[PDB]
Symmetry: C2
Subunit: 253 residues, 2 copies
């Protein structure tokens, strides 16, 4: 039985498939595995959709669009299922960042290579999606961090001329992982946080939506074969929650 | 009676007070107006505090800190009141951005001057604060946008040599206001959204926290005198909601 999901994962690695490219394969498999439903991969959400979705939740929400063609374009596309009611539900939104470049094989033409805040931008890309899914009970948002800024553990790298640079993960000048954390409420890095955790403060059960932030904190880059299962775990749990709204399409017999 | 809050607002403008500087004056007034409470202005929140605050809500939340001295530093500081229980509550967190510079009095040494995404960074600065206040019933987060990227209406500017550049607010190449919108759920730009609006989907009342995004969409820069009342409106509503937890400190007689 360890077949199709096997051969796909291999093919991912055997071509060092892009994060965007992986999601397509993921739909390819997502379909092959539950072939009763109709899966679709797309790569942008028109800023409109978010609003349309928001008014649906509340009239007073989502009522501003200044540049019509505005859209959210997550690096690794989006995979959606078609629910019993003919709408499309979100299953996987992947994105991968590469802030680093201090270790792999006065400012110059380009800035000093020490630290940056390029990752803070995920301002737009997450908030927009979580809002587009404000009426869902899951947030299959996956982020793959990769670079000499997102180190979890310490590692020491040898140099051309003997020196074995010892990079302390928690060096202020080199760790940017902490700017992304607010995106999950301080929860466990590298964990499938696909299912919404309902906190409740003072008689109120307010819903948290956390982005599953993953990172190869040893410095080594992402192994595509693995990027497949990861996304596939998120995916499955998305179908796990969308179960009741998929029921009969599954009950074709 | 239109006295102290008058003279302060004037002094703000009469010195073109910085957004950070205004908040201090705002505390100065916030105190002078309700002199029973103890107000304090600070300018950074140690990444720790957020976590401490988060565990308090839920043990499984806020359990990651990679670079100890990490902190959220909002441009315009923070103003807090001291509640009946000796803790400090958030009253005002102001921040102002200036993405623009295409109108006021091939790339060069610096990039082509047309459009940028520098505002998307507010990834960190808001999510961090709203999380630090996940147990409050208000989000006094105020953002002041200013620049030739945040135009609401269209304006045409004359040039050195006669030309009267006609800038269409909704030109794709020049409008960046739409990247900030997800920060308020599509709600009204330039409005005191200090009070949390509890939406409810499928038997659930999930809490929304929106940042009151303000903008001088005519191109003209921010008039400090006004930046005072604005922040003061947010402030007051923060005390409006923190009323029950301030009660007796107000009942000194």
């Amino acid at each position: 039985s360890q077949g199709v999901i096997g051969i796909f994962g291999d093919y991912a690695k055997a071509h060092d498939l892009a994060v965007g490219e992986v999601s397509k394969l993921v739909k390819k498999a997502l379909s092959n595995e539950y072939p009763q439903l109709s899966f679709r991969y797309r790569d942008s959400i028109k800023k409109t959709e978010i609003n349309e979705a928001l008014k649906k939740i509340d009239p007073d929400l989502g009522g501003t669009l200044f540049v019509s063609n505005s859209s959210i374009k997550p690096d690794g596309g989006i995979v959606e299922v078609k629910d019993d009611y003919g709408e499309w539900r979100v299953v996987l939104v992947a994105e991968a960042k590469h802030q680093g470049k201090d270790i792999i094989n006065k400012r110059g033409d380009q800035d000093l290579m020490a630290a940056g805040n390029a990752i803070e931008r995920s301002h737009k890309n997450i908030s927009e999606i979580a809002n587009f899914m404000l009426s869902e009970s899951h947030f299959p948002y996956v982020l793959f961090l990769e670079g000499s800024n997102f180190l979890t553990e310490n590692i020491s790298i040898t140099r051309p001329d003997g020196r074995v640079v010892n990079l302390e993960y928690n060096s202020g000048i080199l760790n940017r992982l902490d700017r992304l954390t607010a995106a999950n409420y301080g929860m466990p890095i590298n964990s499938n946080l696909c299912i919404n955790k309902f906190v409740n403060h003072k008689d109120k059960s307010i819903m948290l939506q956390a982005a599953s932030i993953y990172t190869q904190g040893d410095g080594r880059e992402w192994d595509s074969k693995i990027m497949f299962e990861i996304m596939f775990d998120i995916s499955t749990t998305s179908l796990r929650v969308l179960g009741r709204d998929l029921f009969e399409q599954l009950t074709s017999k």
